[PDB]
């Protein structure tokens, strides 16, 4: 009797994040103002 068993497994995982933020403000003689902006990006990957 002869038995042969072979097993292989590969797991790969990847994650990327990227956040950007910006802002502005100012006022003269009470004529005020402000602004703000943002951006995001998240990418994941799982391979088995």
């Amino acid at each position: 009797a002869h038995t042969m068993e072979t097993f292989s497994r590969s797991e790969n995982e990847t994650e990327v994040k990227q956040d950007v933020k910006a802002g502005l403000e100012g006022a003269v003689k009470g004529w005020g103002g402000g602004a703000t902006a943002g951006h995001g990006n998240t990418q994941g990957t799982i391979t088995t």
Binding site: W31, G34, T47
Partner: protein
């Protein structure tokens, strides 16, 4: 239809080497992709 005449005997050899063979193969594959975004904007204006 019978092509040849029935013989009185047969030439034979004996072989009793029994064999059992089993093969199993399994394969799996998984692939997950994830993405996400966000955008933000804020604005403000002022006066007295």
């Amino acid at each position: 239809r019978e092509l040849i005449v029935r013989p009185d005997t047969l030439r034979a050899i004996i072989n009793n080497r029994a064999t059992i063979e089993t093969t199993t193969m399994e394969a799996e594959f998984t692939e997950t992709l994830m993405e996400s975004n966000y955008n933000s904007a804020s604005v403000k204006v002022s006066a007295p």
